C-alpha cells in the first residue's frame, strides 16, 4: 500500500526551468515516469513540479 518516494543522490543545477534544481537528500513524489528517462516529479522540499533526471535519484526503501 501507499507510494514509493525517491531521493536525490547528487546535487543538480537545471539548465532550463522545465527541470528542477535539487540537492542531495531532497525527496520527491514521481508524477509521471512513463514518457522517458527524465521523470516529472514533485519536490517535497520546494513544492515545485518539474522534470528530473532518473539517474540522479533512487527509490527510498
Amino acid at each position: 500500500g501507499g507510494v514509493t518516494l525517491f531521493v536525490a543522490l547528487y546535487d543538480y543545477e537545471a539548465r532550463t526551468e522545465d527541470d528542477l534544481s535539487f540537492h542531495k537528500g531532497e525527496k520527491f513524489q514521481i508524477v509521471n515516469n512513463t514518457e522517458g528517462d527524465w521523470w516529472l516529479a514533485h519536490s517535497l522540499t520546494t513544492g515545485e513540479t518539474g522534470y528530473i533526471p532518473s539517474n540522479y535519484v533512487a527509490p527510498v526503501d
Binding site: 547528487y10 546535487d11 543538480y12 522545465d18 509521471n32 514518457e35 522517458g36 528517462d37 527524465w38 521523470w39 516529472l40 522534470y51 533526471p53 532518473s54 539517474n55 540522479y56
Partner: peptide
C-alpha cells in the same frame, strides 16, 4: 525529442 526523452546528464 520531448522533455522526457532528452539525454541524461552524466553522473558527477
Amino acid at each position: 525529442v520531448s522533455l522526457a526523452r532528452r539525454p541524461l546528464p552524466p553522473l558527477p
